[PDB]
Each structure stands twice: as structure tokens, then as C-alpha cells.
Amino acid sequence: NGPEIMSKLAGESESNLRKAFEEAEKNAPAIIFIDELDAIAPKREKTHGEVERRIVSQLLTLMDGLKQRAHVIVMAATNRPNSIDPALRRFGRFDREVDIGIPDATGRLEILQIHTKNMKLADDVDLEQVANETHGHVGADLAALCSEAALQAIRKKMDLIDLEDETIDAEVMNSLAVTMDDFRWALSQSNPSALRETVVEVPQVTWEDIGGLEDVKRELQELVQYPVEHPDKFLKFGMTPSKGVLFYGPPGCGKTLLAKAIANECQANFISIKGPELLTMWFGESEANVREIFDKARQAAPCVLFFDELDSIAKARGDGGGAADRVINQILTEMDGMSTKKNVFIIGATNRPDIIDPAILRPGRLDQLIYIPLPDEKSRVAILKANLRKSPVAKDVDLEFLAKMTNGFSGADLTEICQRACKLAIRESIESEIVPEIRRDHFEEAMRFARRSVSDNDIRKYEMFAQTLQ
Amino acid sequence: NRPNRLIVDEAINEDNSVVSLSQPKMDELQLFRGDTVLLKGKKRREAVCIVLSDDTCSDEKIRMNRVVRNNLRVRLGDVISIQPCPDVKYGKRIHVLPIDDTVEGITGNLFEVYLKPYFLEAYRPIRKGDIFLVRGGMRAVEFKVVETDPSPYCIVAPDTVIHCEGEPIKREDEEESLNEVGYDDIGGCRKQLAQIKEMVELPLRHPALFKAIGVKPPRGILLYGPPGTGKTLIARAVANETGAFFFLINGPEIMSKLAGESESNLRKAFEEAEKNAPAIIFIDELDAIAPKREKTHGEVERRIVSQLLTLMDGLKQRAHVIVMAATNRPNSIDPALRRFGRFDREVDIGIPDATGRLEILQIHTKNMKLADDVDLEQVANETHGHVGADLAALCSEAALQAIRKKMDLIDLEDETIDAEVMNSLAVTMDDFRWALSQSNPSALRETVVEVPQVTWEDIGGLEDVKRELQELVQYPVEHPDKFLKFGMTPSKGVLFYGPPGCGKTLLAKAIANECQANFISIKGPELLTMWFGESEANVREIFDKARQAAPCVLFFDELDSIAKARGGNIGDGGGAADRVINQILTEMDGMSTKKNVFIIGATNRPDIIDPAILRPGRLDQLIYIPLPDEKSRVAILKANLRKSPVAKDVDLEFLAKMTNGFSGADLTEICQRACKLAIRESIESEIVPEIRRDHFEEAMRFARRSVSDNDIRKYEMFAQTLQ
């Protein structure tokens, strides 16, 4: 244990380890695990003390002593790669590394099945729903979750009613039940989720939600799938693949939904650095994270790095400056030294193709550019059928009709009018009660507050660019 | 399972002789209103209280204060057995004697001070063994019914003779001092107690339940809050409530001791504390020793930390002990204790609020005779950033004020404290008035997570907006089903905009009281303060103290506060994404979508807002609050002059047509002006204070239209497209 070896009197810490790796090598093959390495690993400047350093050395050595013919494996876990000290990155000590990303969609759900595999769960127990609302949870967080959950179904049944004594009864337990309403409490109970810092999950959306511009769908695969599922044929010709693409056009057209959707079509990770986080780096002139990010994109392959509001930086500033920006430029660096022959696609979308540093489009980085215009009359229909899939859409509901009504709108605006049909549908519900089928009068009474996010003037601006940009 | 054995809960009735039960419960056990009852509990002992009706009490309960509790030797939870006993004929003799450890200092007629006012034709049915407590003379005196003629139990009538051999009695063991701590001494912690209570209900009440079960006995508990919020108080109360041992540790207490020994101090600490387990090891001021954060410039400093860090992961020893740590803030400590095995659970202890404070005082003035003029309410109505501690000495100084005057000057007090004197002592409101004006070094005034004390009775303008607002807040809160019946998601929040004087906040306030949720208010200035210091890091520290207290409404008065600052309209070459403004989008993006928090923001400048806030997903809902209509102007005053001396001749409908371009603010302006002229009349004559017409009219003289006609249109120009 981290502090376990720090608590002990100084000097003895060296003997503690001394006997540690000693008594552990006797039973070798063994696996010396150390929880909280950084608790004694900052050989960094964070040693304003003497013993603090001496302890570090002791290990630093015992490690290069693992070449003793006993075949033992030393495992060290920690918070982050920055906490430790490069002194252990010696290609003889802790040469191998593995990240333990936080639980995701399929992960969490599965996790619970591991801690509820002993308590009788009623049919109403919707285990799925759980992992469907815990956004930044870890295997630990979800742990006590059950803990409190069961204790809830407990303090009620045998507690108020039962016997316990000299000891509990077998029968009782097996009969005990824990409905969904119990866990509901647990969630609303303790929400101090360990973290909600960054995400390296995999997209839970296929092309079944896109339903627009199918052409782009495959062509995109021409830079990502074909060059990864056919590196033999691609190299047959000789040329080298294209690193990444850059989407551009009017907002509210799910461009992100593409780069993300495709991320599933290729079952890879989807890293998303939205514009705000970029600016946050800008206002703090600490784009150093940039190097910290293109790395977590690498320590997780396959993967698709996506930067929304790519111009978000330039958008802020243009002025007496030129194109290149502190963050923007730094990104080019971690993209230049980005392993060419690796497995990582770099996508970026911007509602402002007019204010991008040309260095990104320069062949070798984002030499591929694609325009995803507004929702064609065609796509408009499915767009609705796709944004109204899991919806109490009545039979009289006729979308083809609307497919000709909203022309300047976008996948976003279309969604706008949608939710509006509901914030009026539910209103009928709650009102009269004190009939859940969305009807026409709603949708129509909804277009009343219709808005065209994309003005006609702009409709042309992106085109002015579109041509020369292509 | 026998409608007799019930569970002992709190006590809605603070009487040393009662066991409030539910109405439908009495009917089950055939008990009248004044049917005296026979209580039978553990430790082979009984008592004789009185049963009552309580609509706010589940049939599966029997309310009773600590007195009725202790005498029954039954903590909160255990099983008792009520019983009708209409044969307890009035008693003849009663021998009650005070306790030596509850009278040190007072002297005199105890039969007239405490017993007389107690058995004042109250017919309180006592018994052999009971230990009733009577408050008076600024203190607590515990008595013991040694022997009574009609033993064991005999009702006390205005005839029953009472004896007082005037001789104390050594407190027994099984008998805890009612002077100890408990829940009946905690104010403003509804959401609070709940938290801790059920967390120890099993690991501290049924140590046997975990003897056979694979459940994790929550061992770590942390308490945030500003010093003075009475953190420690709670801890102790919990123990003395379940009966678990209590081992206390002081922050510097373990640092003072010679180095190295600090490890043994704790070594023996958790050691001697586990012997009496189930126990509750509490540590006052954790951050004093656990700042493994950064201030770790010494070995000893570090070595101490480790010792605990380990003993904590040693709580998996099958002894079922609970370690409680309280501190100033979550940043002071060190994440090393956030290990999901040590201090995995956390609970904030917000500062006292409206209902809290008031209630608190009732806990420290429950011994001193307060005159009728004493307006206890007024107190908690002016102490804005006070804590349970601050309000404490408040009484202290207050009483001492009524003290230095009466017996002090009238010198009956050079020798000792006669009983009679104390009980007669009085402490009017004017006394406390001094206290307030005396020491105002209140603890905090930094931030606030209170609940609005204003309904829609003060708004009186644009009713339409009132309900529509509820269409985004009321429905999702209490109607998630119908809501999810379509799969769509609610709106994170609205963005109020319009001309000053409207009353934007009056909405954010009302709607909050409507949902009786918390109302967090970050006015523009505090925003700028973050801007001029480029430390919007607090932003992350704020959207968090809203989730640590849900439901809750986050409000940002004058969102544009950062706009007009950096330039506003033309400003510089920059665009809307401002350092703070943008950072806010972050803590709003990762803000739990499926959580319980509504984000509202109002701005008298809708023309200079970063469009990223209106983007669907954050503040996709926008509402315009226009000036006072022919109507508003009316109700607005009728309301803005509610608790005021408005004469009968006062005719507002008249003014309802006079001020047209004005706003709820301006209207208020002319109002106060009517008074700063009304009070002016008062004084003069003195050397008949009721608002009248000549005032109001003599007030419109200095009438001002905050909203010019040019602007009146500007917001509309926007209104059209913005909506």
C-alpha cells in the first residue's frame, strides 16, 4: 500500500521493501503488486526532503534486480503518468504500460451483472437503465451502488419485520427482493462519481440515425475502412493513406454525428474535444494538454479524434494577427509527429470554413475536405423518421408533407419543431388528467414557432467557399 | 403482528409525559384523547405517559422525546408496548429528589421553582423510577421519583402532596444524563439528518445483520461546511442516540504530541475505540492533519498521514466501527482518503437558513424566561450569513445583557445564585437587539444555498410567463413519466431578458419557492470578479455546490456583466466567447443531463450574449419579460406595498394610468419616496404615522422612467427574432 511503506519509520522503508521483494521472490513465480506507486514515485521536485528520496532509490534498484532468474512480475498502478517519475520508464523496469479507461456503455451494464449476481432481482428491475444514466462512473462507483441498493430493500423487509436471533435465516434471504425502485434511491442517494474528466468510449450510434447524404457515408469509408481492412491493396499502388478529413458547412447537420457514427461502423474509440475545451486552453495559454490528448488518442486504438468548433479559437480572436493560433498550431505539431503508419483517424468539423489556418488542409494532415450542406428534401423525411424513431408518432402523422414544408431548415431545426410537438403533447396529458399518442394538430401547432437557423445570405456564403474549397 | 409493539420515532410533542400516536392507530387500540397509558420496554422497566393523535405520524410509530426514551431504556428503533391503564387513581405522596450533577450552584425553594410550575394542575402521571426533567432558571434540572404512596404509578392532581427531602442523588449507570447531546438539539437539518441516520442504522444498530451478509458496511463518512456549523455536535448526537461508544480526536491534539507518538496515539485510539465497538471514532478538524494535498514539507508531517490512511483500510476488521471526519472544505483534505474503502461517503453541512436559524434559537433559549415582546422570529430574519455557532453566543451575550442589569445592580448576587431569582429573570427583545448590534463577526457571508422566501405574491406581473415557466420545471420534476413517454428531453434552462425594473429574478426566486428548491445566485459582480482575476476555476466549484444540494436553481444575474465590460457592443476584435462565459458552457455541458438542476440566467442586455448559451442543449429556451402592462402596474403596487401603512384614501387604480413607461423597479422608487417623506412628517411633529395621498402624489414629483422610449423598441427589435 502506498502510504503503507511511508508510515513505517524512515530507513525501515528500505528494509520493508528489502524483505518485500525478498519474501515475494521465495514463492516466485510471483506478482508483486503495488497500489499507489506515485505515493512514493515523485522522484520529481516534490522531494523537499531526504528520506523521501532514499525510498525511491531502494525500488529503482530492486527493479533492476528483477533480472534475478526468478521470473517475477512487478505491477504498479497509479492515478496518472505525470504523477510518477520517468526514472521508472527505464526500458528495464516499468517498460510496459496499459491504460485503464473508465467504464462505458456496454461495460457498466456488464459490471453490475457481476455485483448483483447474488441478490434476487424482481422482474421490474431494469438493470440496463442503470448503465444508461451513470455518465462518468467507475467500476468502484457502481460498486457500493448495489451496496446501498440492496441495503434499501433490506432496511424495509426483515428489518421492520424479521428475525436475526442468534444468526440470520437462509430462507429469508433467498426470498428477499430488490425492485428497480430500490436502486432508483441509490442513484439519487450518492452521486459523488469519482470522475467526469474525459471520455474514450465507443459510439452507440450506427448509420441508422444519419439518413442523409448516403454518398458521403461510403466515401468517408474510403479513407478509413478500405485503408485499414485492405492495407495490402492500398500499398499495392504505393502511395500513402490520408491522415484525416475536415467537415464544414451550416450547423445542425449532424457532421459530428457522422464522424461519430462512422466511429461505430469501425467499432473504434471516439474522442471528442468540443470547441469550449479548446478555448479553455486558449484563455489559459496551456495548450500543453494538446500533447496530453493526441496521446490518449494513441494509447487507445483504433480511435477518431474529433474537434468541434475547430475555429472556436479563431472565432474568439480577425484582428491584427494572422491565421496561426497558439492552440491551433500546437495541434499541427502533435499531428505531424503523429504516427503516420499507426491506427488513428483525425476528423474535425467547423461551421466556419472561412477562418481556418490553411496549415491543417495542407496535404499530410487534413488533405481531405468534405462539404455537408443542408438537409435535401429527400433526407428531410428520413431525418424526421430517424429523429422520431423512439416516438409515439401517430398513424395520421404524415412527414412527407413536412418534407416539402421546411426547406431552409437543418437536422437541428427539424429536431427543434419535433420536441416542440411534445412539449405541447405532454401539456395535454398533465392538464386533462388532473391519451399518449402524438397527433397532427400538435406537429402543425408546432411549426407556428418555426425557425430557420440557416439564413439565405449564409446559405450562399458556405457555397462561395464550397467551390474554391473543393 | 400485535398492534401494540411500536417503533419509537422522534417527538412532535416535547412533553415529559406523552407518546403521540396516529389517529387511525388509537382506534386500533381503543384509546381516548386523555387515556393515560402504560409503557413497557426493555431493561425490565415501564413508565406512564399519555397518548395523543398525530396526523403526521405513521401508524407504525410511537413518538416520544428523550425523557420518555431514556426512562424506557429504548433508543430510537427498539420495540416497546403501549397499554391502556385507566385505573391509575390519583396519587397521595411523591418523593422527588434532584441530582447532584444538575443543581451545582443553585439554592433555595426547589418546590416552587421547578416542581410547582411543572405539576401546575397538569395531572402529569408519574411513577416510581421515571426521571422527568424541568427547565427553568437558565438551566436543566433532572429529578428522580424515589417513592410515591400510590406506588408504583399514581397521577398527580392539584391535591397530591409533594416532598423534597432537599438531598441530591448520585446518578445511576443505566441512567444517561439528559444533559447529553441528541437530535432534539439540532436545528436546520432535515435533508441533513436523513443522510447520516440511515447510513448507520444497520452497521451501528444491528451489528448482527452484517455478521451474515455480503453487504459493505459503509465505514467512511465526511462532513463539509464552515466551522461553527456544529459539525462535531452531530457526530456525538448520533452516538448518544444509538448508544455506541464515542472516541473524540482534536486536530492539533494529535500534532502537539511528540512526533512518532502521534502514530501510537492513533494506534491506541482506534485500538481503545474498537474495544467498545460498535463505536464512532470522530475527528474534529481533519484538514489539520490530512492535508496531504500540497503542504507536506516534512517526514513527520507525512508519516502521520500514512498511519491513518492505513488504520482506515483496517476498518474491515469485523468490529463494525464508523469513522467520522469533519472539515472546512473538500480541497483542504487529500484525495488519498477518497479511496472507495475509507471515506467513500460524503455529506455537506450547509449553513443555517430561514427556518433553520429560527428553530436553532429555540434550542438555546429553551431555558431562559423570554418576555412576550421577545420576537424570536425577527432574529433568524436578519442574520443573513450566520451559523449554528454564531447564533450561539448570540443568546450568550443576550442573556448576559438582561443579567448585568437586574440582579447585578440589585446586588442579590455577590454570594450565590438563588433559585427564585433566576426563574423570575426576564430577557426582552431589546436585550437581543443589543447582542446583534454587539458582535457581528458572523462566520460566513461567502456563498448561499438557501431556499426562496418569496412566492408569486410579490411578482404580480405577466402571469402568462409564470405558468409557461412551470412548463419546463414543474413537469420534468414531478412528471418524468409522461415526459419520457415521447423520449424527448427537458430543457436545461431558460434565459430571461428584458429592460431593468421588470423583475427577472423575482421569477427565478418564485419558481424556486414553487419547487421549494434551493436558489443559488451568482450576481454579475462576482462574475467580473472572476474575470479581472482570470480565475474562473470557481466556476467548476460552483456548478458543483448545486449538485451537492439538488433540487436547485443556478442563477446568473446580469450574464452580460462580462459583456459591457470587455467592450460590449463594438468592444475589441474579440467575439462573444469570453474567458468566464465559455468556461461556464463547459460546466454546463458536463452538467448531469438526467440530474435535478435547472439553469436560469437573466440579462438586461440580450444583444451581447454568446450564442453558445442559446444553442439547444443549454439555454434553448428564451423568454421575454416586457414592462408593466396597464394591469401589472396595478397589482405591482397593491403588492409592493403589502406590509405597509397604506391609507384607505390611497387610490392605486389612479396611478395605474399615470406611470406607463415605468417598471416594477421605478414603481418601487416612487413608493419608498412616499415614505422618506412620510417618516419626515412623523419626527418633526413629535418634538399618527399612516401613509396617505399627499405623500404618494408629492412623490411622483421626482418620477423617473428607467426605460426610455428608444430602448423600449430596441428589445422589441430583438424580441421578434430572439423568440
Ligand SMILES: Nc1ncnc2c1ncn2[C@@H]1O[C@H](COP(=O)(O)OP(=O)(O)O)[C@@H](O)[C@H]1O
Ligand atoms: N440527417 C439527420 N437525421 C436525423 N437527425 C439529424 C440529422 N442531422 C442532424 N440531426 C439532428 O440535429 C441535431 C444536430 O446535432 P449535431 O450533431 O450537434 O450537429 P453537427 O454534427 O452538424 O454539429 C441533433 O439532435 C441530430 O440528432
Ligand SMILES: Nc1ncnc2c1ncn2[C@@H]1O[C@H](COP(=O)(O)OP(=O)(O)O)[C@@H](O)[C@H]1O
Ligand atoms: N444546528 C445546531 N443546533 C443546535 N446548536 C448548534 C447548531 N449548530 C451549532 N450549534 C451550537 O454551536 C456549537 C457548534 O459546535 P461544533 O460542532 O463544534 O461546530 P463545528 O465543528 O462545525 O465548528 C454547538 O456546540 C452548539 O451549542
Ligand SMILES: Nc1ncnc2c1ncn2[C@@H]1O[C@H](COP(=O)(O)OP(=O)(O)O)[C@@H](O)[C@H]1O
Ligand atoms: N413585477 C413586479 N411587481 C412588484 N414589484 C416589482 C416587480 N418587478 C420589480 N419589482 C420591484 O422592483 C425592484 C427590482 O426588483 P427585481 O425583480 O428584484 O429586479 P430585476 O428586474 O433585476 O429582476 C424590487 O424592489 C421589486 O420589489
